[PDB]
Amino acid sequence: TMSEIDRIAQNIIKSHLETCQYTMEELHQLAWQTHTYEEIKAYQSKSREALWQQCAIQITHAIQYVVEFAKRITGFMELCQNDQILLLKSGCLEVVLVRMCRAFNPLNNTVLFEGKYGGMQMFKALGSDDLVNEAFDFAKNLCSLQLTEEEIALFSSAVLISPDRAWLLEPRKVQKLQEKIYFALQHVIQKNHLDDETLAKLIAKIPTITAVCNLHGEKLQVFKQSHPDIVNTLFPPLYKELFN
Template sequence: SCIINKSTRNRCQYCRLQKCFEVGMSKEAVRNDRNKKRKEVVARSPEIVPRSYELSPEQEQMVDKIRCAHQETFPSLCQLGKYTTNSCADHRVQLDLGLWDKFSELSTKCIVKIVEFAKRMPGFPSLTIADQITLLKAACLDILILRICSRYTPEQDTMTFSDGLTLNRTQMHNAGFGPLTDLVFAFASQLLPLEMDDTEAGLLSAICLICGDRQDLEEPQKVERLQEPLLEALKLYVRRRRPSKPHMFPKILMKITDLRGISAKGSERVITLKMEIPGSMPPLIQEMLENSIEGQDNACGQNANKKH
């Protein structure tokens, strides 16, 4: 939603990137590394981090806070003791009720952790309660998908939940993902080459959450002001971590747009699931995920023509 011109173009890197796409810049120009000819030279020489990529003490403090919030609400794959189940492991069915019960239980717990993560974001508690709820509902599915996809194991084509339950693609389909399954697994595969660490995953989650373009916000400008330092911190951190890959920051940022599309379909899936399960939808899942379909069209990065 930022106005992008010569004097303001450096204030919001995300909106600047979206503006470039609006006027015809090819996404392939971002996706493809323009420095292929220099790769061999770079590989042989040590990476030198330019001083311009250094974070200020205040930025370091903010980044540390977000990384800790992410790690303490989302254990990494290496911290989990994996376990599997043989339930519907080799053929797809509309819905396996045993898997659904487990999946819905774990999803509810994950939503609780996302709420805890949100409350620890810099500036988030200063927003009105109404805006906090609006942002949480709009971003919950984005963060949920980002988190489960970061626990993808390509060798086995499996995903692992926070209690260690590890399901293959067929089981994920039968647990409730249904027609969303292959889209989610494709996104997980696209995350792998980015090699994001906990800091980058935490910052990306925070940027998904604190987005001033969400519908029905009472103070959208305040939300935008809170998002700006998150974008700047992610840009500096990514470039400091990968000084020889200058296009990695926009590549990572573009994943927000991909998440928006998956989340929109995910919200629709929650609605169709209500007709497939025998009982009622767990209240927290219905409250947080079904309602996230509201405002998806106006989510930042999704439609530049629908702005506040």
């Protein structure tokens, strides 16, 4: 029933419009804003703990918006609460990564961080260039597809509503909603990207999105070894809860 597909699509697009940390309008105005050399130096001078704490806050900030995104999606809130929790815990960062592509400049490889765009050298103090490089390469590759806001909305929702997450009690229900989302997205893609493979190319990036996020979890686990106190007493409570 196209009627249902359309309503589901509109609801997700509406939710996305109302729940990104940065609206398209704000992004357009923040377009030409890269950190100054002094600001970049400042970032590189921060301790590893200090920068990690800053990164943890920014990520948590973005994750909180993904939670709002999910709550405004009718089909999501119809899933039993247990699965809602599982989808969010396993997919919040993946959605943030997809959304991050909206705030990534593929010409000079810079990402919006704390109000301005900065290259990967901005994260030097993390001592995790492999993680950063992987995050940037994905963003750069997703940006090459030139997705519209509607496509990003629908795709980010498909990433979130994944019937493959382990421990789901009612996977089939998640699968059913995700199929309606993918079918909606496939049609939207026709409006833009003439000559595609686009949906298939997007779907093929799913495992990559997950690899970047697992790498994040790994880098974090080691950080917890070196600085346990900073994690349990300084990082945002939600960040600790989701990745510990």
